[PDB]
Amino acid sequence: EHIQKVAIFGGTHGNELTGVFLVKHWLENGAEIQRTGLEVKPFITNPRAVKKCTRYIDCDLNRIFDLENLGKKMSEDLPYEVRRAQEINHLFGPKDSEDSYDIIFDLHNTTSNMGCTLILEDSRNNFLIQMFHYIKTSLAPLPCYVYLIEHPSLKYATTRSIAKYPVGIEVGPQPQGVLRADILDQMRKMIKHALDFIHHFNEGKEFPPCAIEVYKIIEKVDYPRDENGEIAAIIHPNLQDQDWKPLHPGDPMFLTLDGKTIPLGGDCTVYPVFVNEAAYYEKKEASAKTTKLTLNAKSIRCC
Amino acid sequence: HIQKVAIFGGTHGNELTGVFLVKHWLENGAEIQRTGLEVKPFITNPRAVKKCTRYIDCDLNRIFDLENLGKKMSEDLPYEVRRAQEINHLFGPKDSEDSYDIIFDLHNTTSNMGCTLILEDSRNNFLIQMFHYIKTSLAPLPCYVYLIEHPSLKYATTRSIAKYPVGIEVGPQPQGVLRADILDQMRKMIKHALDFIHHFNEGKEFPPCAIEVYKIIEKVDYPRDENGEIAAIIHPNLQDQDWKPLHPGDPMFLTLDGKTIPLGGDCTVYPVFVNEAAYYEKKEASAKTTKLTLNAKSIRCC
Ligand SMILES: CP(=O)(O)N[C@@H](CC(=O)O)C(=O)O
Ligand SMILES: CP(=O)(O)N[C@@H](CC(=O)O)C(=O)O
Ligand SMILES: [Zn+2]
Ligand SMILES: [Zn+2]
DSSP states (O other), X not given: OOOOOEEEEEOSSTTOHHHHHHHHHHHHOOGGGOBTTBOEEEEESOHHHHHTTSSOSSSOGGGBXXXXXXXXXXXXXXXXXXXXXXXXXXXXXXXXXXXXXXXEEEEEEOSSOOEEEEEESOTTOHHHHHHXXXXXXXXXXXXXXXXXXXOTTTOOBOGGGGSSEEEEEEEESOOTTOOOHHHHHHHHHHHHHHHHHHHHHHTTOOBOOEEEEEEEEEEEEOOOBOSSOOBOEEEOTTTTXXXXXXXXXXXXXXXXXXXXXXXXXXXXXXXXESTTOGGGTTTTOSEEEEEEEEEEEOOBOOO | OOOOEEEEEOSSTXXXXXXXXXXXXXXXXXXXXXXXXXXXXXXXXXHHHHTTSSOSSSOGGGBOSHHHHTSOOOTTSOHHHHHHHHHHHHHOOTTSSSSOSXXXXXXXXXXXXEEEXXXXXXXXXXXXXXXXXXXXXXXXXXEEEEEOOOTTTOOBOGGGGSSEEEEEEEESOOTTOOBHHHHHHHHHHHHHHHHHHHHHTTTOXXXXXXXXXXXXXXXXXXXXXXXXXXXXXXXXXXXXXXXXXXXXXXXXXXXXXXXXXEOOSSSOBEEESTTOGGGTTTTOSEEEEEEEEEEEOOBOOO
């Protein structure tokens, strides 16, 4: 390949502050994210949401980088994030074109207890799978996990999907509208190793094949509800904070006030991720369920 | 002779535990009723609960003062000012003797505070006695008393209407989130508070008692840019360390470059509301308090 244009996005969601805080400082001083032989542009994707310290103004930005929206006629009637998405496509894409950026990192926080998390959009992309393995390995003994969101119908159109090689970086648990120092330090390490990986690769380092554990989306699940549609039971204490860890069909999952336990059910184990993410109450996702599988990558090298 | 008791929920609309309890209790109040004691549950800010946001126009829990409660009712007022009146009329009026006797106001914080109780008056013997019974009942689950009375720095709360205003605060919890363990703690806190009222209305005698409280002295902001932007954040040694002592040597903030900013001044303090999401706009990274003992006379009733 050889890797030319790399961006780092922060503030895709305005109330996930770690990225906004990093990105604002790197806009004032890029040293940390520069590598010799490699320019990297930091950028604030949703500045209006950042100012109102809110997830979004009109709709969720990280859901709408698709043809329906990016091809619409530009006007003032449109939702702000739609208007905004096109401006980003124009500056860092166009999506699906060779004139696009090569790599975009999109920075995020979650209220779920997920630790360092990388988000893989493509199960058979050797370059990204090698990146993630490098990062995992470099972070150790600190855990790092890979959420694979590829699905026939459930994959959503991300800010970073613009890029040839989209990457999502997600670090929790952190309350919305808060800057924790230990979370901050973790996003930074994550990024440090990713950029190290690119540099290495660009200087013609050869990577043997690798393999990684990832968690593949199967199904999102809502909180159980009323006939009024109000929440009837919450995340059971035993499932609280147990993102990534295996959940068997008899195991507790929800809890009513009364309080009776509602268990998992079905006839196979699953790995929950995004357990009790604040921003998903709105989307009716109390938890995602994943299967854990191992992916391989071929060798890769530059020129 | 403690007649009217209310439990308020959703003073802040994104602090979900209270909303969840109050909405359930409205449908079946058995948990909070006691033998010969009628306690009304109520949603203070229903519109902010609908949007799942702290407030709409301004913070409901600061404006139960004369400045706001004396305004002429009108569609042009900020929503929360209109609500503060409506509420005052139902459960007050504030400073009258027709006002409710006890109001419990339920809250959540992103700060690591555990079970906490907000004392608005350092003299009230009844509260001190209640707060002793709860703290003690809860043990060894820790429970703490934050005393916010102060010449200039006390703010006009939703519960300040009542003769006996009680704030109930549990954390750490993210806004927009219902955590089971937090839910459980909050309702053990109420269990014991209502139990104490019942014990008092059954004539049971309470001897003198002392408790430790944390008295406000001042609130500090995050250090800032030339542009008013945040330039340091809560140090990792201070993160989640509410209530624990912090000496002038000790570290308070951290910059992106790695620079540690120490406490300074001349005495130990006990910080409270360390890194509370909602106080970023109020420019209070933390509040500093001194540890203090308060004594209550014994009490009975008739
Ligand atoms: C909790 P979040 O909003 O950072 N999660 C992202 C997931 C992602 O980065 O794809 C989203 O929901 O758009
Ligand atoms: C973090 P919070 O909104 O529960 N704190 C209360 C403090 C209180 O209960 O007096 C407030 O800011 O009004
Ligand atoms: Zn996000
Ligand atoms: Zn509150």
